């Protein structure tokens, strides 16, 4: 049994995309199907349904007049179409269905989609060192770092020493600023006496944009 | 809609507790409740449905119960793999989810090693200054992170950011950041980050003078 989706991406706030939802395992063409969405960081809310034969179709009072739920059971696929997307439309969507039918509980669920709305341009980061110190020692221990800042959209990965340094690394969550641009920082903590010694150079890319930069940060 | 609200929002446990969340429904929806298990970057997992029937292949030792508004799920013996956020749902009517409740490793307290990262000149040039403030390995997750210039609280200037448990050794780290213009920043002079943690007995303060 598996529901697969795509469709999702960066969308201006006004503008539409389609999901998708290829079911397979199971006969499709019987069951309720569901569109779930769950916002960055929150917990879980329907947002449209539809009846097997793909007869009655039912909303949320959010997404009402603005989302359409439909089906094509020749091609075992589920679709929302979302027209006039507003930025509180930024989620996960995942399709859902009850397999069991008695169980009257989402047993099946896809792996996800996520659907970005936002009037911000795709930017490429700049990168600035987080550099070691007396500041950034305590005991043996130097911390040092990147910041990875300004960005759009998400994702960005970031290594050190490429890959031959993973240990002490913490790569932390991206912040939204009220820019609508992403910000995040890398660091690794190492010992004072490996700098240096030794070379750090983290490794961020960026692959929304075709940027890819390998920052130096030094002591 | 129904609403449903559960209790714990987060609680600690260790590998081989008993722990139990409870949940309760605006109204009377009888045995119509589901449990489902989250992990991060995962969708949802079925867990119990009909209050008291356990999914599929869910182990023997998860075990729902409660009947009209009041109903708790149980782990009898809690494994590494059960660290998870749990949320609760009415399927009496339309459906309607709890808020949820994160389950996280307990282990002993570890306060935070802090560490003040000035703006690099790299950065400056650009016309825009991002102090950093990094408290690396801590447990519990609970600490606060106030930001400080001329000894003047910062408000609404600074953004924080959490890791997983580290899995490893099951502590937590914070990276806040500072953002100001070059201007407030060439503009004032004692830049400090101020952390509150129940592993320092008072509030320990990183600072540096600019220049």
């Known amino acids: 049994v598996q529901l697969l989706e795509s469709g999702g991406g960066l969308v201006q706030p006004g503008g539409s995309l389609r999901l998708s939802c290829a079911a397979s395992?199971?006969?499709?063409?019987?069951?309720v199907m569901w569109w779930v969405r769950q916002a960055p960081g929150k917990g879980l809310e329907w947002v449209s349904?539809?009846?097997?034969?793909?007869?009655?179709?039912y909303y949320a009072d959010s997404v009402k007049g603005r989302f359409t739920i439909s089906r094509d059971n020749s091609k075992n696929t589920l679709y929302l179409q979302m027209n006039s997307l507003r930025a509180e439309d930024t989620a996960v969507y995942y399709c859902?269905?009850?397999?069991?039918?008695?169980?009257?509980?989402?047993?099946?669920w896809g792996q996800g989609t996520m659907v970005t709305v936002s009037s911000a341009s795709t930017k490429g980061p700049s990168v600035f060192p987080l550099a070691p110190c007396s500041r950034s020692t305590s005991e043996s221990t130097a911390a040092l770092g990147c910041l990875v800042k300004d960005y759009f959209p998400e994702p960005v990965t970031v290594s050190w020493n490429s890959g031959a340094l993973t240990s002490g690394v913490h790569t932390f969550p991206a912040v939204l600023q009220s820019s609508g641009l992403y910000s995040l920082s890398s660091v690794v903590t190492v010992p004072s006496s490996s700098l240096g010694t030794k070379t750090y150079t983290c490794n961020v890319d960026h692959k929304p944009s075709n940027t890819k930069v390998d920052k130096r940060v030094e002591s | 809609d129904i609403q449903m609200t559960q209790s714990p929002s987060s609680l600690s446990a260790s590998v081989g507790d008993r722990v139990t969340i409870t949940c309760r429904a605006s109204?009377?929806?009888?045995?119509?409740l589901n449990w489902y298990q989250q992990k991060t970057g995962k969708a949802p997992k079925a867990l119990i449905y009909?209050?008291?029937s356990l999914q599929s292949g869910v182990p023997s030792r998860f075990s729902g119960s409660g009947s009209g508004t009041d109903f708790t799920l149980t782990i009898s013996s809690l494994q590494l793999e059960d660290f998870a956020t749990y949320y609760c749902?009415?399927?009496?009517?339309?459906?309607?989810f709890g808020q949820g409740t994160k389950v996280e490793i307990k282990r002993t307290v570890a306060a935070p090693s802090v560490f003040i990262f000035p703006p690099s000149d790299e950065q400056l040039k650009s016309g825009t200054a991002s102090v950093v403030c990094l408290l690396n390995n801590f447990y519990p997750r609970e600490a606060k992170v106030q930001w400080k210039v001329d000894n003047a609280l910062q408000s609404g200037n600074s953004q924080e950011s959490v890791t997983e448990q580290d899995s490893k050794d099951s502590t937590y780290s914070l990276s806040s950041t500072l953002t100001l213009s070059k201007a407030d920043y060439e503009k004032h002079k004692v830049y400090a980050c101020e952390v509150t943690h129940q592993g320092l007995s008072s509030p320990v303060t990183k600072s540096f003078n600019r220049g």
């Open positions: 109204q009377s929806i009888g045995s119509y």
């Open positions: 749902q009415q399927s009496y009517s339309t459906p309607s």
């Open positions: 859902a269905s009850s397999y069991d039918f008695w169980s009257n509980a989402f047993d099946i």
């Open positions: 349904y539809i009846w097997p034969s793909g007869g009655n179709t």
């Open positions: 009909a209050a008291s």
């Open positions: 395992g199971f006969t499709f063409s019987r069951y």
